Amino acid sequence: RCTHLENRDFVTGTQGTTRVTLVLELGGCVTITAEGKPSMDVWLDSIYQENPAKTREYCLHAKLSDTKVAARCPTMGPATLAEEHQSGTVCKRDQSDRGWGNHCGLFGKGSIVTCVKASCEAKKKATGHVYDANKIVYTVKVEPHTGDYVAANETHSGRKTASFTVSSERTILTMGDYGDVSLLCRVASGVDLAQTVILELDKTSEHLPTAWQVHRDWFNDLALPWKHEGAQNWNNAERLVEFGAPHAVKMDVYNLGDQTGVLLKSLAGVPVAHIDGTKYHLKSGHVTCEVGLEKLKMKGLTYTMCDKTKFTWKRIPTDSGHDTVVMEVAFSGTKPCRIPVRAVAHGSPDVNVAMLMTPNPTIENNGGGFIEMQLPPGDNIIYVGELSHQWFQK
Amino acid sequence: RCTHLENRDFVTGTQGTTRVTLVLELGGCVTITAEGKPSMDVWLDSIYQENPAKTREYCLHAKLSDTKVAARCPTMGPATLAEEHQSGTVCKRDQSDRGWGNHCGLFGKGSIVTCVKASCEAKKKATGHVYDANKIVYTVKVEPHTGDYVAANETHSGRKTASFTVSSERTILTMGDYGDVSLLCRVASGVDLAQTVILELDKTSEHLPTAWQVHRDWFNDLALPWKHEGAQNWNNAERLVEFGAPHAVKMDVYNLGDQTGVLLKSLAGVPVAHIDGTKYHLKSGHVTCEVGLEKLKMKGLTYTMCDKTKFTWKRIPTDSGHDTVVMEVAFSGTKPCRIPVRAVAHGSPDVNVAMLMTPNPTIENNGGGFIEMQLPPGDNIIYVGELSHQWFQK
Secondary structure, three states, rough: OOOOOEEEEEEOOOOOOOOOOOEEEEOOOEEEEEEEOOOOOEEEEEEEEEOOEEEEEEOOOEEEEEEEEEOOOOOOOOOHHHHHHHOOOEEEEEEEEOOOOOOOOOOEEOOEEEEEOOOOOOOEEEEEEEEHHHHEEEEEEEEEOOOOOOOOOOOOOEEEEEEEEEOOOOEEEEEEOEEHHHEEEEOOOOOOOOOEEEEOOOOOOOOOOEEEEOHHHHOOOOOOOOOOOOOOEEEEEOOOOOEEEOOOOEEEEOOOOOOHHHHHHHHHHHHHHHHEOOOOEEEOOOOEEEEEEEOEEEOOOOOOOOOOOOOEEEEEEEEEOOOOOEEEEEOOOOEEEEEOOOEEEEOEEEEOOOEEOOOOOOOOOOOEEEEEEEEEEEEEEEOOOOOEEEEEOO | OOOOOOEEEEEEEEOHHHHEEEEEEEEOEEEEEEEOOOOEEEEEEEEEEEOOEEEEEEOEEEEEEEEEEEOOOOOOOOOOOOOOOOOOOEEEOOOEEEOOOOOOOOOOEOOOOEEEEEEOOOEEEEEEEOOOOOOOOEEEEEEEOOOOOOOOOOOOOOOOEEOOOOOOOOOOEOOOOOOEEOOEEEEOOOOOOOOOOEEOOOOOOOOOOOOOEOHHHHHHHHHHHEOOOOOOEOOOOOHHHHEEEEEEEEEEEOOOOOOOHHHHHHOOOOOEOOOOOOOOOOOEEEEEEEOOOOOOOOOOOOOOOOOOOEEEEEEEEOOOOOOOOEEEEEEEEOOEEEOEEEEEEOOEEEEEEEOOOOOOOOOOOEEEEEEEEOOEEEEEEEEEEEEEEEEEOO
């Protein structure tokens, strides 16, 4: 959740910097590191609104019923059945080729209308929701970068959270023993959340997708029948119906079937949005923080060095990703000790080249001893006391 | 089925014409009329092949099962589960973001493939058939134009049929008592019936359409998984599957759902082809006939005129459509009599202007006495003996 996340920046300062101003986008993480304070990771974990507002619904499959055909003789009048008074029904008026051998009198064209009742099928609804900047929640998380951490989904009593609305952006956070990071987070959505919609389908028992963040323009002009929250019936039922020509005095009525394919066509390469029932997640957004570290303290520098021998390599210094070396160690002897780390560049043994992200590495009780250092390029030798390993830097 | 059909031509001759050469397209009708013979209607009723050849099938909805995920550590190797040996299965290879907190060792990208089994759903097949000129059947129908007929779907022992293959186009036809129309019909398909296909869906209990005559090019490049007649499994299953990105070591697999809408989209305004189980109907085609009437005879001219009074109007001379006047009459007295018809143009009473399509109109037992005449333009008076009615001609 930070050595992991490919989207990792650092931020470093003069000791007499004490504000930092970042942007955090989603599921990027930043490691802030600063002279004589402990490196923190800050990151933006979640944007969402709970019970967002429902928008129009869309029919993806029509239920057609009661084909109604009424037709008049070519002088007589024009025809009507009065179900074109009603809604959630689809009606075409044609003229039918009418003679004698079709119960008429004059040879001519003999006005005809057929209507049909259009309802939507059991669970083939598609449902918008809209966001309100005033109701949305931005979640930043701080966690010290000491790596007395766990593996990628197990919390931690240092590792704290701050939740910002638009309307409240000024939390202070207690980092186990290290003191207080302050946060100030000017919220910034992305689009007009009156121009942006979470679109949902019904979970139709497959490996098929449920949900998409999508512009409110595109949604609103979709090719489908629609209503607002549980309404009478459907406007634009005719989007899903089509009529035959008239033979005689009958006129065929068709269901252009199931738009599910058609919609997921539309949505090709739109990536799916996320949802925890209540909580609707934005996929897009960022937030911009003033991270106030005038008030962190070091991991207890109050401790005596680990006996320089009793270390063994939990993890071989391995390439990190983000342009650092990281290593775990086990040190069997005494308990809470400050660790002796150092590394040096062939040529020059009397000068330490280790630039630590892991400033005052300790081995604690439960455990500890992850080290992240950045090293000059070339053949170096890394030392945790006497324990050593090679390193080449590219 | 001929005063009805908007698509009616006539053909008329010198008495010493005896061949006629027509084209008949489908569900157009021609009325041939000729000095001192009885007017016939000829027309092309049906083109079809029985049990046409099946082509590829197309899947309109996939059944996905057994998502199989296998992934390797970023030095280790590349990954395989061996279900990408198999077919009717869909496999993507990605690289997954792999670290320490994902059971690995090196920080890197750690080759992963997931496969899924793709079968097609209960009755969501789409099925071509192809035509063979050698196997197709062209049906012409002759029926005398005396209108001792019925109403638009009740046969008649005069009204005869001739069925032409490519390979046999020379029937002679016995018209009740009138003699023999000969027919010679040089068959002409339309498209290469190796470039033309009846496309079918499964009758999915709606007012939805089943069938379409369609070019074999378009069909063959459709966006769907396919097999030949009941095969192992499906090629191009991947047309209907799509994969998530890889989180960790898992990689999501999706069903782009139901192509029915998508296909009927494609087919918008293609009009539906027809099918009687065995018999597949072309919607397009025509056939070109030499109609040999050197051998028709008149309705029995052997009869005495109807008493000129005892006629009453079954149907008022009404506009036909096709540029003729048509009328029915009832004549209560004696029985088989030849009818006295005539009409005249204000100005000039001593000269008959009635040009009959209904040359030797009789009233028979069961019944009779439909008259179709064509009249010069202006105020005329039509007379069946003494019975009379006005006519204006435009």
